[PDB]
Write a protein that binds this DNA or RNA. Structure first.
Lengths: 155, 95, 79, 107, 95, 222
DNA sequence: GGGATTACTCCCTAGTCTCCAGGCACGTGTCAGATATATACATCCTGT
DNA sequence: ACAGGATGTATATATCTGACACGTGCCTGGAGACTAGGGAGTAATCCC
């Protein structure tokens, strides 16, 4: 059950590594049924977690992110990538995992900024999971070119 | 505030008994209310005339039954008298 | 002259709901007349009920009573 | 002394006490029997059920889970007995039965 | 162009399924007040009263149109004529 | 107020005259073919302060709907930037080949107004550092088998479940996890006997009783 | 035969104080629906 | 008739509003126990 994927396999290794590191990380993904199945995986391998998509109401959104940012032990988030572009606060987060690399770099970097806040204390590292020979490398290249044109025009 | 009574909760309960997974609109609610009111006035009126015809000053269950036999047609009246008799019998037993 | 307010296609529509395929030309004026008489009687009784209640505003219940006393009970407005 | 309703004792839903009050203060007779309110409430509740049932059926036919006046009209005008009962009754926003004569049908 | 009869039947099927009012609201209101101004001066009308009047009016007219159509078909015709309306009213006991 | 509000209240607020429209987030107004942008057009506003996240995707119909809507005298010149949309498609070709200078100095003329940049270097000097680490992965046998089952599906559909975005975003899903595409639930061996099927779900509500109804279809009658 | 009337014992309902809860008046919440975004391909209509 | 650019479709998410729905304070009409006047039940009997 849910393992049988290399993305998930390397994620399993790095989640063990960051448990040894002692850093509560993140997830961002596009299609939150994957987030449901990852919820099952993480409840399974015994990781205290919290979930935040668009389906939760606004007071629940702000209160569960407050409950994260006051508690130093709950270990992994679940977020919609695009709906992470709110005015939320994640200073207590310290590491980022993108399970996906979809089109807009400013969404991805915006969620990165939601981690890499003005109140950020330490280096936050970001792991973008990549496959081989498959279409997410194409989307990575296309987004990278669009990022390039964006940054040269408004630098 | 002057509360105005209605048969809303009752027809709602009946609705839940016969069709647990169906709803009811406000217009149809008022229609059902007016319906029950009309039949009430009809049966009670005919029962009153029955009591007056036989020089009686008391409307018992007999007058109501005869009135239902006169107003409702055919099988509707039969089942009505059936349900009525069942109810008045069960009420008579359980004090 | 508001009886002409009830237009020809309106009467046509009513006839369609009644299940009529072809309509004569002399139908419309007749319909206006019949409607005029019907409304005359009903509104007369309604205003009578209103004046009996010492009110200057004819309510819906007055219409309901008026229709009920003409043998045309109406559900969905009280009573 | 642990009061209970007369509707519960009669195994009905419609208010027996309310019906009794209306009969008393409705200028129908000087006195009213004790079987009259339970009997009348039973008949009213039964008729209510018979209409709501067919109305629920007509509602199910139109793929709607809320009974509207149209469903009530379709329920009453098809049941011959119910139709005779409400022959001089006009149901608001109920429309008419879809009925086209054979002569008006295309050749 | 459809043959003369198809659009008519389509309209019959169209309006026999609908339940909303057919006569325009404001002209009917003006007619109501014009007829009412001969019984009581400076009359005020509840909206629900006017709506009730229109519901009963359209219902009456449709019911009359059915019988009228039946009178028309009875005389081996597919066109309603004033004779049919007058006959219907006569048998109903209104004329 | 907000945006669906002013697409509702547009017929009202067009009678209200304004000196300061302040759009805070025009990445909600990121594109044309946009009823929100069109209702933002029809007001009488002397100052329309345009704010967003940043400029985004270099289709630059985005940059049209910025540049012409914000200011006159470029107000229709975005269809001159349709010839610079030929520049915008060779902007991909110069993402390949950065050796052209036709609009950039002209944009330096343009972007001395119309824009005001405060940089990350002004703000990250307070902060520390952030570093991306790129980790590659693979496909499992079942995963690569379903991926080239999708390649057999484009083999059979360029020549079921044939949506084109089933194609692209299920390439994405089979990167993510194969069991999103339908998986069988927890199984059992086949049963030969005769049990008792439950009639419906909406009858036996809460207090039900299970009955050992297991009998063999093989009967022996004595 | 059976409806009218009469003599007469009596059960049944009006009447009344107490009182308590079901039901009215009016309050906060929940999906349904709409409208977006975005990514390709698919397709249709028109002009060339 | 074929090519090109428009609109259309598809899969997956998102936000934001509408017309329902449920939930609660609290009055007044129903229920309970009771007496006693009396309409009604019922046997008897004239006689249409």
């Amino acid at each position: 059950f849910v393992t049988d994927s290399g993305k998930l396999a390397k994620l399993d290794e790095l989640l063990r590594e960051l448990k040894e590191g002692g850093h509560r990380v993140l997830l961002y993904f596009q299609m939150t049924r994957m987030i449901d199945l990852m919820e099952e995986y993480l409840t399974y391998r015994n990781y205290k977690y919290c979930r935040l998509d668009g389906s939760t109401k606004l007071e629940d959104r702000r209160d569960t992110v407050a409950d994260f940012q006051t508690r130093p032990e709950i270990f992994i988030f679940l977020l919609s990538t695009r709906a992470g572009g709110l005015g939320i606060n994640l200073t207590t987060a310290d590491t980022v995992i993108f399970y996906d690399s979809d089109w807009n770099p400013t969404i991805d970097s915006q969620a990165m900024d939601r981690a890499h806040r003005l109140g950020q204390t330490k280096q936050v590292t970001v792991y973008r999971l990549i496959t081989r020979g498959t279409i997410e490398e194409r989307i990575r290249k296309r987004a990278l070119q669009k990022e390039e044109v964006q940054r040269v025009v408004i630098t | 505030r002057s509360r105005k009574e209605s048969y809303s909760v009752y027809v709602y309960k009946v609705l839940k008994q016969v069709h647990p997974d169906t709803g009811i609109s406000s217009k149809a609610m008022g229609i059902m209310n007016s319906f029950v009111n009309d039949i009430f006035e009809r049966i009670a009126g005919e029962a009153s005339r029955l009591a007056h015809y036989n020089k009686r000053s008391t409307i018992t269950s007999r007058e109501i039954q005869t009135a239902v036999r006169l107003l409702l047609p055919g099988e509707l009246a039969k089942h009505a008298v059936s349900e009525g008799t069942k109810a008045v019998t069960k009420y008579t037993s359980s004090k | 002259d508001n009886i002409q307010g009830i237009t020809k296609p309106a009467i046509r529509r009513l006839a369609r709901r009644g299940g009529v395929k072809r309509i004569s030309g002399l139908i419309y004026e007749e319909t206006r007349g019949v409607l005029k008489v019907f409304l005359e009687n009903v509104i007369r009784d309604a205003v009578t009920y209103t004046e009996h209640a010492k009110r200057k505003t004819v309510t819906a219940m007055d219409v309901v009573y008026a229709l009920k006393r003409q043998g045309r009970t109406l559900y969905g407005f009280g009573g | 002394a642990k009061a209970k309703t007369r509707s519960s004792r009669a195994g009905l839903q419609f208010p027996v006490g309310r019906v009794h009050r209306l009969l008393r203060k409705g200028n129908y007779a000087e006195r009213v029997g004790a079987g009259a309110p339970v009997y009348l409430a039973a008949v009213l509740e039964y008729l209510t059920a018979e209409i709501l049932e067919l109305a629920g059926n007509a509602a199910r036919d139109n793929k709607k889970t809320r009974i509207i006046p149209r469903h009530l009209q379709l329920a009453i005008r098809n049941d011959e007995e119910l139709n005779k009962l409400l022959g001089k009754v006009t149901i608001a926003q109920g429309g008419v039965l879809p009925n086209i004569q054979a002569v008006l049908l295309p050749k | 162009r459809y043959r003369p009869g198809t659009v008519a039947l389509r309209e019959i099927r169209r309006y026999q399924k609908s339940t909303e009012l057919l006569i325009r609201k404001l002209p009917f209101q003006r007619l109501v007040r014009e007829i009412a101004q001969d019984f009581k001066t400076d009359l005020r009308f509840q909206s629900s009263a006017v709506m009730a009047l229109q519901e009963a009016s359209e219902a009456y007219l449709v019911g009359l149109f059915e019988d009228t159509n039946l009178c028309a078909i009875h005389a081996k015709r597919v066109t309603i004529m004033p004779k049919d309306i007058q006959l219907a009213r006569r048998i109903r006991g209104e004329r | 107020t907000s945006y669906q509000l002013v697409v509702s209240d547009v017929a009202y607020f067009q009678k209200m005259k304004w000196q300061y429209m302040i759009l805070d987030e025009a990445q909600a107004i990121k594109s044309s073919q946009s009823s929100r942008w069109k209702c933002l057009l029809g007001f009488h506003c002397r100052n329309r302060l345009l704010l967003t996240g940043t400029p985004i995707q270099n289709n630059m119909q985005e940059l049209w709907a910025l540049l012409h809507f914000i200011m006159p005298s470029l107000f229709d010149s975005h269809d001159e930037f349709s010839e610079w949309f030929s520049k915008d498609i060779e902007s991909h070709a110069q993402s390949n080949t950065k050796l052209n200078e036709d609009q950039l100095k002209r944009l330096h003329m343009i972007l001395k107004p119309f824009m005001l940049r405060r940089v990350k270097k002004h703000v990250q000097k307070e902060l520390g550092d952030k570093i991306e680490i790129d980790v590659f992965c693979e496909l499992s046998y079942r995963q690569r088998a379903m991926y080239q089952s999708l390649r057999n599906q484009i083999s059979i559909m360029d020549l079921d479940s044939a949506t084109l975005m089933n194609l692209v975003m299920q390439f994405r899903k089979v990167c993510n996890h194969p069991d999103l595409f339908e998986r069988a639930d927890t199984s059992s061996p086949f049963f030969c006997g005769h049990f008792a099927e439950t009639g419906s779900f909406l009858r036996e509500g809460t207090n039900v009783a299970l009955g050992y109804s297991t009998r063999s279809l093989v009967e022996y009658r004595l």
